[PDB]
Design an enzyme around this catalytic site. Structure first.
Site, short mmCIF file in Angstrom:
data_model
loop_
_atom_site.label_atom_id
_atom_site.label_comp_id
_atom_site.label_asym_id
_atom_site.label_seq_id
_atom_site.Cartn_x
_atom_site.Cartn_y
_atom_site.Cartn_z
CB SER A 10 2.04 -0.12 -3.93
OG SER A 10 2.26 0.08 -2.54
CB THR A 17 -0.95 0.03 1.22
OG1 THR A 17 -1.89 -1.05 1.11
CG2 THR A 17 -1.73 1.34 1.29
NE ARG A 76 -0.27 -5.05 -6.78
CZ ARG A 76 0.89 -5.29 -7.39
NH1 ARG A 76 2.00 -5.49 -6.68
NH2 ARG A 76 0.94 -5.34 -8.71
CB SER A 108 4.53 -1.73 1.99
OG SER A 108 3.58 -1.70 0.94
CE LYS A 111 -4.68 -0.14 -1.41
NZ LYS A 111 -3.23 -0.45 -1.25
CG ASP A 165 -1.57 1.15 -3.81
OD1 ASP A 165 -1.71 1.59 -2.65
OD2 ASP A 165 -1.44 -0.07 -4.07
CG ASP A 218 5.63 -1.36 -1.89
OD1 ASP A 218 6.31 -2.28 -1.38
OD2 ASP A 218 4.47 -1.09 -1.51
N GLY A 236 -2.30 -0.89 6.49
CA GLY A 236 -2.29 -1.88 7.57
C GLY A 236 -3.40 -2.90 7.40
#
Ligand SMILES: [Cl-]
Ligand SMILES: [Mg+2]
Ligand SMILES: [Mg+2]
Ligand SMILES: [Mg+2]
Lengths: 231, 250, 244, 226, 243, 204, 241, 240
Positions: free
Chosen positions: D169, D1, D19, D129, D33, D17, D166, D47
């Site tokens: 993500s 994320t 995902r 992340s 999100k 993002d 990342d 989280g």
């Protein structure tokens, strides 16, 4: 009248009738006397029987080695209050290694009785108590009323016809306060005091109850042939 | 202390009457008139802003209240009792519905929850009944537009049109003559203003009248754009100016 | 203190009657009449709404007949708000039983549970009783079609035909006269409407003043269907039976 | 994320993002999100996904009731205070890491929030992340007095850094712009730089390919009349 | 009628009759006073000698709260003790959380709110005492008097009980004749006089005088009982003034 | 030891043109031991369908719980619950056990009776909703299902074509999982007809 | 006739205990007044110290609830202080929970809700007080919100409370009928206090010394009370024109 | 919680709420119990003011507490259900802990204890119910019959009746029941029980219920026709 249904109601003149009625139960009770010198403190109590087959109701209760009381009124209420005193004396010894002062014992009894005079659902205690004891400031005598009022005295009496004994002690004040180091003479004065409250009946061997506490004397109760010496 | 009134203060009398409920209804009767009319494409609820003093700012006192974006309420009777019921009604719409199903309750079920609260004040220990009657107007997808009355007893009934409080008997007769099943929202507002004028003594304008509608979705009142399925609240309170515009065509 | 204001809702009279129960029954006698009739092939529930208005939205209105589950329904006589409290409790009890045993709750077990709740308010708690009498119409595979009634005392009894609310004395006499054991649902529908038509305090019995329901095995093969009649359907059955 | 928040001239922007993962597996390729606490207060969560979603709705619900009670539009500091006290009470067991942004009568605001209850203020923030990849872009291109167009550009560039660098993500960029004196504009799938290419082959089967033992009609209708 | 049978009931006047009946119990009690001096406060009380059998100086009436506050009351003595016990709990919790000893105005409200709470319900009875209390804090000396209704104000001088009218008149003279103020030692002397003068309303039985004080210079801001030579000096001054 | 893989099993759901499909295997086991080949994991409340994988005791408990709740819903609302609303109810119910959760992987499938729109959704054990437009997978062979669905799926498949796609997705995923198989069921759901088909598959 | 002792309905749908609580409100025989300026809100109240033994500095019916909110009370002091302590606790809790200062109108609503509960629950009596809350709200500006024993509350352009409230109310009404605005068009709070005192003198027909009045002033970010010498300066300015 | 003392003493030493509970029992339909040499019979009155009743489903007057003990009652019907439920729970609890079913005396002592408790507990009124409890102790062939009342006192009876007009049927039983020779068979015991109810009942139709309890959990309720045959034979002997 309209203001005596419960303890939570003042009258228009500021009286609490339920408390006054509880005070009346003491006046119906049998006479008991308390007096002290500078070395000793004495309780004398006239025990009452139901009839000739019955025993004589006990009047004196030990609270600790150095403290105890006599009762007049509802006996079960005296058992509740004396149990509380036993616990408080005991808490003082266990937690602080300290014998509970007689004056502080009076303060605790006052506060316990007070809570029953300001709340709904409860009732006042229906008993009067005379507490004697010997602590770090010498001999003491207390008078407890279920209104909450506790008073320290040289001598007093409560119960039926207690006024005769109270007047006698008021005369003898200067004499009996000086009876130091002589337990027998102090008890004699107490037996003579309680005699001023007798009518028709006299002090017999199963009628009389005496208690004493002092400088080198644990609180001890005398009944039966142990009081024949004073009859 | 402690609440030592654990017994009912409302009880049946020998004749079968529940005295405290009847007396609560009497308090409602003394209250200022409020009404509700249902149209084909909306619902209108209205009442008089009986100002206690001219020094008082009557805009700060809301007699017509939003319960959910699609449900509104008005009352007759004791104002303070109404205010706390609105607080409880707003909360119960969330706790017993929105936090479970992720959507606002339908009108009939929110009414049911408010009714339950009012019923309990009629049986629970150490309380009196609420001294109000409520008129609750609303819309939901599967039931369409609806209007409900809730009484102090907790009883509720659905209406095409009705009135409560001071001049309710005369107002209900007036509504019976004018109501039909082909009314548009503007027609219902017009009839509401006509009906309300009869029970008002003094000034009759946008500042002394409180009026709200349940109608079309208002995307301009949503506060955000970007989600096609969210189209805005159906509850809208009419402004002072909007009321006065319709008082010229009266 | 507070004792002064306590009505003492759960005491006996010198004659051994419960004051509040008796007075709650007096309240119920002014409520609209509800009738239940049990036949071999189903049960009928008929009930009169109380003096209505032309501006009342009837098709979305419910004050008399309530669904407890798919097999059991109730007719109400008394305080509607009080009834809805008990009705919701009964709906929950039925679901509790279904979750526990994976079988639909037998009619009597549901009736006993609600009746016990009513009983409690007469013996402890110091609260007023519920001013409600129920007629329970239901079906289970043990006893088949069943009719029960319960009142504020928490007492319940079983019936072939029964009325609650206003004019029960007159209604019960009329039912006792025309009821027979081999009766069918269509005959019972007619008896219920004829009885209400004669006992009503209104000038005439019309569709807008009635709520109607049937529980039939007239559901395609070995199963039971509940039918809460619509306003137009009550109007049709009134014409069919020749009352309007 | 990857989630970011950026302050600008007359408001604030947040981005994320799309995902969501379960270990190394992508559960949903177009996840939402960006959450709404109130019309003009939005937050993005990293989280434990159920915790961010649940804590947002609870506080959002209580914020709505508070707004109705006080007859005032909700404030970001109220959402912040209610979120942090709730999260502190649960001692980090509610795994919600949030960036909270919005406009209210007081002005425009940007805060972040960590599962244990600690809060932060800033002109630019990142969480998740992909926060290090995003913060690298923010630290390279952020300046004072950004315009609306510059802030949207910076925010989405920071999310892209997370998307590409990342593994936690990916997919698309969602944006929400909250400007003072305006409706908040939610821009779902603002960027779509990860459309799957056409497959080499169709995998539609001939009818009758699967072996069947029994067929039956399922009764979804209620018990019928007559 | 019936409005006076239950506590917390408003009469058609807007009065709580049960609280007014509690005042009658206060008016029936012995006289107690308070005098605010230059750097402290003095408290004094009349103790009726019901009998010769009462041990002199033993049945102490004035009570200390914390180490800087003195309390005296007229009316039902047990009720006063109950109020002081609560006051001691309030003062302990204040000092526990905030470190500093409770200020006198702060302490006044704690007693006030507690007494007021006993006028809110019919399940409790109002307090049958009026309490005069005070002491020294960081802002100087403070004297308060608290009634059964929960009502309290700050005072220059205060009096309650059977001889309150007599005492009040004496206190008013001191306020007029000393705008600059009274010393702590002067206030002890004056307190003795006022109790002796107020004893005319209770002239049947003889009495015992009890005095206490808190002063910044004389007691370091701590509550102390007046004993021995200083007490006798005040008794002599009082006896001289009545003759 | 891991509660979500003691009993085994899988569920998959897909959308098509004016239709949805939901399918599951029939196995219940005690780790290596196969116990039952008739343990269906798809339930329905009105026109809303719910598949549940994971710990079997919780599968049974949750079915009984949602039957309980949807029955009360219907009595009060006077209408059958919709897929969108039921999805929120599942989420709410799971999250209330946040720190003592049901060890399950629920899947919702259905068509909204008013809009006619096909709907599917998935959840983790703690309530987080996954509202895909294409497909949802769950169970001990979820990795395998993700692989099958990602390649086999295309949008707007007709009901009878969607049947073949979802059936082949389930079957081949199950055959690569030790704890799944022992039979399979596929539901094809249209606005007012639902067909249920039991598939023939290897019994090892 | 126990419907007169507790808060249940009488046959006329009235709550007598609430009505009698309104009567207790005037037991102190004190009148108060509140007005709004451009930047401020002013509240004045009569001060009466009938006993010479009283410390006059401790006799007050104006309370500093929070930094921004002030409250004047009409009614007995025990109930006044009860309400004051609660209002202070509520205002502090609000700031802790929601991160901003409790608005004047919101506190008024909260205290009004608490009062409503006492009219519905039997074991609790109403408080015999009327509470006038004043502030300069950060959203609404100068604010006056008043609560009573029935649980009723509303905002005011200006207001008056006490035995002679009607005389003051009519006096204020007549002024705002002339000016046709909702406030006192004055820059400084000093002149708004002078307006308030002048119009109380006119309405009551009595003159005031520095010890006969009690004044509270709300400005942006603080509420404060004036000393006797601050009031004296105000009285001197009134007399000099 | 609601704590009000509803059951209290009066100046003459009476507890009126308990005494008024007995008046509710006086109003209830008549119940009778008769024990023979090897059986106990419980008879109950059904008031015929209620026809159109469904007798299949209507609560029956005699209730099984366990397979070997039964309970009948006079008074408030709703109140009796609470005592019956408690008794049934206690019967199963006794089997669970002692591993033996309750004796008739034990079950009586429990129910009587519950009734007493409701006469000196705050916030509750006494049960408006008197009960007849009958059966056989496990592995015992001696008949048992006990009675309880609202106050909580209980005792054993050779034969007893409770409810409305129970004064009349007790009169009958006192002159017709011989202790030296109790009804030796089931027939004789049922006949004497039906005879006792016919002194009070009205029509011998659906107004009389009869339940026979024999040793070793043998409990059966007689039907309308079986009872009707007793009713017929009794009056044909009476015409003489
Ligand atoms: Cl509130
Ligand atoms: Mg396999
Ligand atoms: Mg295998
Ligand atoms: Mg009240």
């Amino acid at each position: 009248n309209n203001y005596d249904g419960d303890t939570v109601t003042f009258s228009p003149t500021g009286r609490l009738f339920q408390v006054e009625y509880a005070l009346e139960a003491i006046k119906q009770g049998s006479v008991t006397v308390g007096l002290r010198s500078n070395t000793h403190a004495v309780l004398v109590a006239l025990k009452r029987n139901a009839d000739e087959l019955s025993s004589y109701q006990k009047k004196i209760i030990k609270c600790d080695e150095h403290m105890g009381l006599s009762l007049a009124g509802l006996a079960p209420d005296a058992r509740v209050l004396s149990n509380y005193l036993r616990q408080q004396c005991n808490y003082s010894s266990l937690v602080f290694n300290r014998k509970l002062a007689v004056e502080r014992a009076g303060h605790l009894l006052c506060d316990k009785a007070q809570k029953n005079t300001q709340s709904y659902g409860g009732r006042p205690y229906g008993v009067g108590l005379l507490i004697i004891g010997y602590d770090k400031s010498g001999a003491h005598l207390l008078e407890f009323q279920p209104s909450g009022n506790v008073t320290e005295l040289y001598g007093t009496a409560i119960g039926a016809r207690s006024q005769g004994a109270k007047t006698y002690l008021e005369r003898t004040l200067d004499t009996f306060i000086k009876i130091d180091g002589n337990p027998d003479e102090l008890i004699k004065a107490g037996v003579e005091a309680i005699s001023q409250s007798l009518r028709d009946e006299s002090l017999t061997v199963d009628n009389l109850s005496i208690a004493i506490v002092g400088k080198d004397t644990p609180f001890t109760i005398y009944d039966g042939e142990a009081v024949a010496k004073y009859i | 202390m402690t609440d030592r009134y654990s017994f009912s203060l409302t009880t049946f009398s020998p004749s079968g009457k529940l005295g405290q409920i009847d007396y609560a209804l009497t308090a409602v009767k003394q209250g200022v008139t409020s009404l509700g009319i249902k149209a084909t494409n909306g619902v209108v609820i209205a009442t008089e802003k009986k100002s206690s003093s001219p020094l008082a700012m009557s805009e700060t006192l809301s007699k017509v209240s939003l319960l959910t974006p699609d449900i509104g309420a008005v009352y007759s009777g004791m104002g303070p009792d109404y205010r706390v019921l609105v607080d409880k009604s707003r909360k119960v719409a969330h706790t017993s519905y929105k936090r479970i199903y992720g959507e606002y309750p339908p009108t009939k079920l929110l009414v049911s929850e408010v009714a339950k609260i009012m019923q309990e004040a009629t049986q629970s220990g150490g309380v009196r009944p609420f001294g109000v009657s409520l008129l609750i107007a609303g819309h939901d997808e599967f039931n369409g537009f609806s209007l409900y009355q809730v009484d102090p007893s907790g009883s509720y009934f659905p209406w095409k049109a009705t009135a409560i409080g001071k001049g309710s008997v005369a107002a209900k007769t007036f509504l019976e003559k004018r109501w039909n099943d082909e009314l548009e929202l503007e027609d219902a507002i017009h009839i509401a203003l006509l009906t309300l004028k009869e029970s008002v003594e003094g000034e009759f304008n946008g500042d002394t009248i409180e009026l709200a509608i349940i109608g079309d979705e208002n995307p301009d009142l949503l506060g955000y754009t970007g989600i096609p399925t969210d189209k805005g609240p159906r509850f809208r309170k009419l402004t002072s100016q909007e009321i006065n515009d319709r008082l010229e065509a009266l | 203190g507070s004792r002064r204001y306590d009505s003492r809702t759960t005491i006996f009279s010198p004659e051994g009657r419960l004051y509040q129960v008796e007075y709650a029954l007096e309240s119920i006698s002014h409520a609209g009449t509800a009738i239940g009739i049990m036949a071999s092939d189903g049960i009928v529930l008929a009930a009169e709404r109380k003096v209505t208005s032309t501006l009342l939205e009837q098709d979305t209105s419910t004050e008399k007949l309530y669904k407890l589950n798919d097999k059991i329904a109730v007719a109400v006589a008394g305080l509607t708000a009080d009834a809805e409290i008990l009705i919701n409790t009964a709906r929950i009890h039925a679901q509790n039983y279904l979750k526990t045993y994976n079988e639909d709750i037998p009619v009597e077990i549901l009736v006993r549970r609600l009746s016990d709740i009513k009983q409690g308010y007469t013996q402890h708690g110091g609260l007023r009783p519920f001013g409600v009498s129920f007629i329970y119409a239901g079906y289970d595979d043990r006893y088949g079609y069943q009719l029960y009634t319960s009142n504020p005392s928490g007492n319940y009894t079983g019936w072939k035909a029964i009325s609650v609310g206003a004019n029960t004395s007159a209604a019960q006499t009329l039912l006792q006269m025309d009821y027979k054991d081999d009766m069918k649902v269509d005959d019972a529908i007619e008896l219920a409407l004829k009885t209400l038509s004669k006992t009503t305090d209104s000038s005439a019995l019309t569709y807008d003043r009635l709520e109607f329901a049937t529980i039939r095995k007239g559901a395609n093969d070995g199963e039971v269907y509940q039918k809460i009649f619509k306003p137009q359907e009550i109007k049709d059955i009134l014409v069919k039976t020749g009352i309007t | 994320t990857t989630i970011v928040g950026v302050k600008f001239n007359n408001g604030v922007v947040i981005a994320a993002d799309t995902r969501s993962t379960q270990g190394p597996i992508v559960a949903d390729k177009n996840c939402a999100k960006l959450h709404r606490i109130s019309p003009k207060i939005w937050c993005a969560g990293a989280g434990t996904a159920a915790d961010t979603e649940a804590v947002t709705q609870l506080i959002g619900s209580n914020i709505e009731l508070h707004s109705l009670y006080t007859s005032r539009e909700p404030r970001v500091v109220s959402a912040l205070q209610m979120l942090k006290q709730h999260l502190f009470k649960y001692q980090g067991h509610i795994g919600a890491y949030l960036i909270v942004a919005g406009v209210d009568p007081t002005g425009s605001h940007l805060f972040s929030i960590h599962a244990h209850g600690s809060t932060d203020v800033g002109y630019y923030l990142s969480l998740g992340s992909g926060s290090l990849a995003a913060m690298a872009v923010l630290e390279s291109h952020w300046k004072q007095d950004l315009t609306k167009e510059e802030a949207i550009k910076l925010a989405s560039d920071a999310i892209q850094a997370g998307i590409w660098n990342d593994l936690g993500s990916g997919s698309n960029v969602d944006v929400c712009v909250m400007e003072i004196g305006k409706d908040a504009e939610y821009l779902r799938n603002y960027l779509t730089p990860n459309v799957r290419e056409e497959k080499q082959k169709s995998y539609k089967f001939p009818r009758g390919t699967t072996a069947v033992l029994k067929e039956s009609i399922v009764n979804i209708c209620d018990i019928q009349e007559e | 009628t019936g409005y006076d049978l239950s506590n917390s009931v408003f009469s058609p006047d807007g009065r709580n009759f049960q609280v007014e009946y509690a005042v009658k119990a206060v008016e029936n009690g012995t006289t107690s006073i308070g005098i605010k001096c230059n750097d402290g406060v003095v408290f004094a009380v009349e103790k009726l000698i019901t009998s010769k059998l009462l041990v002199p100086q033993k049945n102490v009436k004035i009570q200390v709260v914390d180490r800087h506050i003195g309390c005296v009351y007229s009316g039902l003595i047990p009720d006063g003790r109950h109020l002081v016990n609560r006051g001691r709990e309030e003062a302990a919790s204040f000092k526990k959380l905030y470190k500093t000893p409770i200020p006198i105005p702060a302490f006044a409200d704690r007693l006030g709110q507690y007494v007021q709470a006993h006028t809110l319900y019919n399940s409790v009875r109002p307090f049958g005492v009026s309490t005069i209390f005070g002491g020294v804090d960081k802002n100087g000396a403070h004297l308060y008097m608290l009634e059964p209704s929960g009502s309290y104000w700050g005072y220059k001088g205060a009096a309650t009980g059977k001889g309150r009218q007599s005492a009040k008149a004496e206190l008013e003279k001191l306020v007029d004749h000393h705008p600059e103020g009274l010393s702590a030692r002067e206030a002890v002397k004056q307190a003795a006089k006022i109790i002796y003068l107020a004893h005319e309303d209770n002239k049947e039985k003889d009495f015992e005088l009890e005095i206490s004080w808190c002063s910044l210079s004389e007691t370091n801001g701590l509550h102390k009982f007046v004993k021995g030579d200083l007490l006798q000096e005040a008794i002599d001054f009082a006896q001289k003034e009545i003759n | 030891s891991d509660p979500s893989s003691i009993n085994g099993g899988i569920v998959v759901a897909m959308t098509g043109k004016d239709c949805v499909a939901i399918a599951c295997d029939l196995r219940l086991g005690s780790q290596s031991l196969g116990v039952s080949n008739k343990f269906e994991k798809i339930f329905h409340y009105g026109h809303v369908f719910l598949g549940i994988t994971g710990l079997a005791t919780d599968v049974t408990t949750l079915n009984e719980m949602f039957r309980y709740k949807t029955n009360l819903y219907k009595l009060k609302e006077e209408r059958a619950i919709e897929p969108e609303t039921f999805t929120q109810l599942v989420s709410s119910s799971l999250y209330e056990r946040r720190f003592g959760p049901y060890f399950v992987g629920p899947v919702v499938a259905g068509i909204n009776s008013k809009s006619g729109k096909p709907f599917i959704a998935g959840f983790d054990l703690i309530g987080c909703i996954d509202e895909a437009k294409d497909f949802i997978v769950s169970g001990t062979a979820s990795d395998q299902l993700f692989g099958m669905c990602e390649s086999l799926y295309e949008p707007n498949l007709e009901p009878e074509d969607l049947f073949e796609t979802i059936s082949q997705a389930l079957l081949n995923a199950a055959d690569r999982d030790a704890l799944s198989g022992w039979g399979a069921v596929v539901y094809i759901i249209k606005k007012d007809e639902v067909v249920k088909r039991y598939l023939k598959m290897r019994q090892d | 006739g126990y419907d007169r002792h507790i808060t249940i309905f009488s046959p006329e749908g009235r709550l007598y205990q609430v009505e009698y609580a309104f009567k207790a409100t005037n037991q102190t025989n004190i009148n108060s007044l509140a007005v709004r300026g451009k930047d401020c809100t002013v509240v004045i109240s009569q001060k009466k110290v009938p006993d010479k033994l009283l410390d006059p500095t401790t006799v007050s019916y104006i309370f500093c609830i929070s930094r921004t909110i002030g409250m004047v009370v009409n009614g007995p002091i025990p109930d006044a202080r009860n309400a004051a302590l609660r209002a202070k606790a509520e205002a502090a809790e609000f700031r802790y929970k929601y991160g901003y200062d409790m608005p004047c109108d919101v506190l008024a609503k909260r205290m009004a809700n608490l009062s409503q509960i006492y009219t519905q629950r039997a074991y609790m009596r109403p408080l015999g007080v009327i509470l006038t809350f004043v502030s300069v709200d950060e959203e609404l500006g100068p604010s006056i919100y008043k609560t009573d024993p029935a649980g009723y509350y509303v905002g005011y352009k200006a207001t008056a409370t006490g035995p002679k409230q009607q005389e003051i109310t009519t006096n204020l009404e007549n002024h705002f009928k002339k000016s046709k605005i909702d406030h006192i068009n004055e820059e400084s709070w000093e002149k708004v206090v002078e307006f308030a005192i002048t119009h109380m003198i006119d309405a009551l027909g009595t003159e005031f010394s520095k010890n006969d009045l009690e004044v509270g002033v709300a400005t942006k970010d603080k509420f404060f009370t004036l000393s006797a010498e601050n009031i004296e300066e105000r009285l001197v300015a009134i007399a000099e024109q | 919680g609601y704590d009000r003392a509803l059951s209290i003493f009066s100046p003459d030493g009476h507890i009126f709420q308990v005494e008024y509970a007995l008046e509710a029992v006086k109003r209830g339909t008549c119940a009778v119990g008769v024990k023979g040499k090897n059986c106990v019979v419980l008879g109950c009155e059904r008031r015929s003011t209620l026809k159109l009743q469904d007798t299949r489903i209507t609560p029956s007057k005699v209730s099984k507490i366990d397979s070997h003990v039964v309970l009948s009652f006079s008074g408030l019907n709703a109140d009796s259900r609470i005592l019956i439920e408690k008794a049934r729970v206690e019967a199963q609890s006794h089997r669970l802990t002692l591993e033996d079913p309750v004796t008739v005396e034990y079950l009586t002592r429990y129910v009587a204890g519950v009734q007493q408790r409701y006469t000196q507990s705050g916030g509750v009124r006494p049960f408006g119910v008197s009960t007849l409890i009958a059966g056989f102790d496990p592995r015992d062939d001696e008949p048992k019959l006990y009675q309880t009342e609202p106050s909580g006192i209980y005792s054993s009876w050779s034969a007893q009746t409770i409810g409305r007009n129970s004064k009349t049927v007790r009169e009958f039983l006192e002159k017709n029941y011989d202790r030296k020779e109790p009804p030796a068979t089931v027939e004789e015991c049922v006949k004497l029980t039906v005879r006792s109810l016919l002194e009070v009942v009205q029509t011998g139709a659906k107004n009389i219920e009869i339940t026979v309890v024999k040793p070793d959990s043998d409990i059966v309720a007689l039907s309308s026709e079986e009872i009707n045959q007793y009713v017929t034979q009794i009056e044909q002997e009476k015409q003489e």
